Enzyme design. Structure first.
Site, mmCIF file in Angstrom:
data_model
loop_
_atom_site.group_PDB
_atom_site.id
_atom_site.type_symbol
_atom_site.label_atom_id
_atom_site.label_comp_id
_atom_site.label_asym_id
_atom_site.label_seq_id
_atom_site.Cartn_x
_atom_site.Cartn_y
_atom_site.Cartn_z
ATOM 1 N N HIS B 41 146.250 -36.356 -89.995
ATOM 2 C CA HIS B 41 146.497 -37.533 -89.183
ATOM 3 C C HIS B 41 145.956 -38.822 -89.775
ATOM 4 C CE1 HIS B 41 142.406 -37.009 -87.508
ATOM 5 N NE2 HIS B 41 142.460 -38.315 -87.345
ATOM 6 N N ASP B 90 145.755 -30.067 -88.942
ATOM 7 C CA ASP B 90 145.264 -31.354 -89.393
ATOM 8 C C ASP B 90 144.373 -31.243 -90.627
ATOM 9 O OD1 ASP B 90 144.899 -34.037 -89.191
ATOM 10 O OD2 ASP B 90 143.298 -33.872 -87.646
ATOM 11 N N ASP B 184 128.570 -35.913 -80.637
ATOM 12 C CA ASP B 184 129.878 -35.438 -81.134
ATOM 13 C C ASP B 184 130.414 -36.266 -82.295
ATOM 14 O OD1 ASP B 184 132.684 -34.483 -81.116
ATOM 15 O OD2 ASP B 184 133.114 -35.511 -79.277
ATOM 16 N N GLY B 188 137.304 -42.086 -86.549
ATOM 17 C CA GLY B 188 136.917 -42.682 -87.825
ATOM 18 C C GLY B 188 136.193 -41.708 -88.721
ATOM 19 N N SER B 190 137.314 -38.644 -88.829
ATOM 20 C CA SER B 190 138.225 -37.591 -89.228
ATOM 21 C C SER B 190 138.187 -37.355 -90.736
ATOM 22 C CB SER B 190 139.626 -37.755 -88.775
ATOM 23 O OG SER B 190 139.768 -38.353 -87.395
ATOM 24 N N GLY B 191 138.282 -36.085 -91.088
ATOM 25 C CA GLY B 191 138.290 -35.731 -92.501
ATOM 26 C C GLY B 191 136.907 -35.500 -93.054
HETATM 27 C C1 LIG Z 1 141.641 -39.573 -87.275
HETATM 28 C C2 LIG Z 1 140.133 -39.635 -86.663
HETATM 29 O O1 LIG Z 1 139.243 -40.287 -87.342
HETATM 30 C C3 LIG Z 1 139.755 -38.984 -85.344
HETATM 31 C C4 LIG Z 1 138.467 -38.258 -85.027
HETATM 32 C C5 LIG Z 1 138.165 -38.134 -83.554
HETATM 33 C C6 LIG Z 1 137.329 -36.920 -83.234
HETATM 34 N N1 LIG Z 1 136.886 -36.879 -81.868
HETATM 35 C C7 LIG Z 1 135.837 -36.194 -81.400
HETATM 36 N N2 LIG Z 1 135.467 -36.215 -80.124
HETATM 37 N N3 LIG Z 1 135.136 -35.472 -82.283
HETATM 38 N N4 LIG Z 1 140.851 -38.229 -84.703
HETATM 39 C C8 LIG Z 1 141.588 -38.831 -83.761
HETATM 40 O O2 LIG Z 1 141.363 -39.974 -83.393
HETATM 41 C C9 LIG Z 1 142.770 -38.103 -83.140
HETATM 42 C C10 LIG Z 1 144.043 -38.574 -83.871
HETATM 43 C C11 LIG Z 1 145.061 -37.556 -84.212
HETATM 44 C C12 LIG Z 1 144.613 -36.301 -84.609
HETATM 45 C C13 LIG Z 1 145.487 -35.286 -84.976
HETATM 46 C C14 LIG Z 1 146.850 -35.507 -84.954
HETATM 47 C C15 LIG Z 1 147.316 -36.751 -84.557
HETATM 48 C C16 LIG Z 1 146.418 -37.752 -84.200
HETATM 49 N N5 LIG Z 1 142.983 -38.257 -81.728
HETATM 50 C C17 LIG Z 1 142.108 -37.879 -80.817
HETATM 51 O O3 LIG Z 1 141.043 -37.352 -81.057
HETATM 52 C C18 LIG Z 1 142.513 -38.028 -79.343
HETATM 53 N N6 LIG Z 1 141.601 -38.706 -78.387
HETATM 54 C C19 LIG Z 1 142.930 -36.594 -78.991
HETATM 55 C C20 LIG Z 1 143.492 -36.486 -77.617
HETATM 56 C C21 LIG Z 1 142.699 -35.918 -76.617
HETATM 57 C C22 LIG Z 1 143.182 -35.795 -75.325
HETATM 58 C C23 LIG Z 1 144.461 -36.249 -75.036
HETATM 59 C C24 LIG Z 1 145.249 -36.811 -76.022
HETATM 60 C C25 LIG Z 1 144.760 -36.923 -77.315
#
Ligand SMILES: *C[C@@](*)(O)[C@H](CCCNC(N)=[NH2+])NC(=O)[C@H](Cc1ccccc1)NC(=O)[C@H](N)Cc1ccccc1
Ligand SMILES: *[C@@H]1O[C@H](CO[C@H]2O[C@@H](C)[C@@H](O)[C@@H](O)[C@@H]2O)[C@@H](O[C@@H]2O[C@H](CO)[C@@H](O)[C@H](O)[C@H]2NC(C)=O)[C@H](O)[C@H]1NC(C)=O
Ligand SMILES: *[C@H]1O[C@H](CO)[C@@H](O)[C@H](O)[C@H]1O
Ligand SMILES: *[C@H]1O[C@@H](C)[C@@H](O)[C@@H](O)[C@@H]1O
Ligand SMILES: [Ca+2]
Lengths: 96, 252
Positions: B41, B90, B184, B188, B190-191
């Site tokens: 993502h 992902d 948690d 930002g 991610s990865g």
């Molecule tokens: C890409 C990032 O940096 C990030 C990390 C967030 C991790 N969160 C926690 N609590 N550790 N990831 C996101 O923002 C993702 C984006 C995404 C990921 C995979 C595929 C497509 C997009 N989105 C989320 O974490 C959302 N809040 C997930 C979600 C939860 C509930 C309902 C709808 C979406």
């Protein structure tokens, strides 16, 4: 020879030559069925001793290899780096 | 990272920072001198791929201290089963145009043999996750590498402490963290690596993927289950380079 009940943990003895054979229950292994599953030297019990990898589906015993940049040591279980910066060691605390 | 501690400069040598034209985009894990693991993502909405940079040996984004090492991302390889916008699979393997130089502040994390990861690494109670992502759900990103120690959960326990329409945890994912709103990974990060220590060596076990907000009371954080992508990753590193900037390599 099967008279002295050598077969431990409910093993089934059978007289052979001037000795015997122990046919062990599922969970036990050894000449006399002396060792249990959870005490054996297989990979599921604490990574069979190995510091890094382990194997045991090829019969006789268990081996213990290492990850690139590391080599096995004397004992057949420990591992040591073979490069300056091996993967996953934090140099500043490796020197401390 | 929410409720984390500053990673003492030097203690997160595989940490990677991903930039898009100077802007912070995600984290990554150094696994070899030209290879970093990250999350698919992060690349969902990218128009310019020549401005995608990886920075290693980074620590404080507000000061240059010479251990930083930057390399342009030459290519991003994502599983063919990944679908932009949904969270399954992902993961991404990024190829650096030119190798980085391993240094005291720059070292790869081991990419573990799958069976060890599943038989032993998966039962280690805690693991580190780290990054420069938001320090709060709608808060500021860090200036310094933050790191956190989170306990792992079996998926059947992941929602026990808790939107029906939130993503579903699949088998290509796992949960880790705390359900009390304290700690948690967050947007930002991610990865970034979810790293696990075992008899003196650190191994890559998960990738920061997503969560319900960040440190939401009742919920935990979701990570990519690296053990399912070992062979996949190995084969792409041992094969010959492939042309292209974004590749959907078959998975498995
Ligand atoms: C890409 C990032 O940096 C990030 C990390 C967030 C991790 N969160 C926690 N609590 N550790 N990831 C996101 O923002 C993702 C984006 C995404 C990921 C995979 C595929 C497509 C997009 N989105 C989320 O974490 C959302 N809040 C997930 C979600 C939860 C509930 C309902 C709808 C979406
Ligand atoms: C997470 O999954 C739930 C439900 O899980 C079941 O979903 C069925 C659609 C089916 O695939 C079965 O395999 C599965 O295990 C999702 O909720 C469902 O949402 C659909 C529409 O998307 C509605 O038709 C249902 O009424 C609803 N059922 C339940 C129990 O909630 C939810 O969509 C899914 N999350 C995401 C992001 O897809
Ligand atoms: C009794 O059984 C045999 C007899 O042959 C002996 O060798 C074992 O050591 C004993 O326990
Ligand atoms: C031999 O005999 C009896 C007593 C059972 O315990 C068997 O399973 C064993 O092989
Ligand atoms: Ca810096």
């Amino acid at each position: 020879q099967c008279a002295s009940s050598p077969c431990q943990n409910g093993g089934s003895c059978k007289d052979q030559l001037q000795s015997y054979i122990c046919f062990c229950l599922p969970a036990f292994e050894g000449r006399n069925c002396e060792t249990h599953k959870d005490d054996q030297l297989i990979c599921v019990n604490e990574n069979g001793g190995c510091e890094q990898y382990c194997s045991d589906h090829t019969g006789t015993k268990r081996s213990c290899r290492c990850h690139e940049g590391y080599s096995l040591l004397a004992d057949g279980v420990s591992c040591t780096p073979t490069v300056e910066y091996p993967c996953g060691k934090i140099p500043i605390l490796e020197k401390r | 990272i929410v409720g984390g501690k500053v990673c003492p400069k030097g203690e997160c040598p595989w940490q990677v920072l991903l930039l898009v034209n100077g802007a912070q985009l995600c984290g990554g894990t150094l696994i070899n001198t030209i290879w970093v693991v990250s999350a698919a993502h992060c690349f969902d909405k990218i128009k310019n791929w020549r401005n995608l940079i990886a920075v290693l040996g980074e620590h404080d984004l507000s000061e240059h201290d010479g251990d930083e090492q930057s390399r342009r991302v030459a290519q991003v390889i994502i599983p063919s089963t990944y679908v932009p916008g949904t969270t399954n699979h992902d993961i991404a393997l990024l190829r650096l145009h030119q190798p980085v130089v391993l240094t005291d502040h720059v070292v790869p994390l081991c990419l573990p043999e799958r069976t060890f990861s599943e038989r032993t690494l998966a039962f280690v109670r805690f693991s580190l996750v780290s990054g420069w992502g938001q320090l709060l759900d709608r808060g500021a990103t860090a200036l310094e590498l933050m790191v956190l120690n989170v306990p792992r959960l079996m998926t059947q326990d992941c929602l026990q402490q808790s939107v029906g329409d939130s993503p579903n945890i699949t088998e290509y994912m796992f949960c880790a963290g705390y359900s009390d709103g304290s700690k948690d990974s967050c947007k930002g990060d991610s990865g970034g690596p979810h790293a696990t220590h075992y008899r003196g060596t650190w191994y890559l076990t998960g990738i920061v993927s997503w969560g319900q907000g960040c440190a939401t009371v009742g919920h935990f954080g979701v990570y990519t289950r690296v053990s399912q992508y070992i062979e996949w990753l190995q084969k792409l590193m041992r094969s010959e380079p492939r042309p292209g900037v974004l590749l959907r390599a078959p998975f498995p």
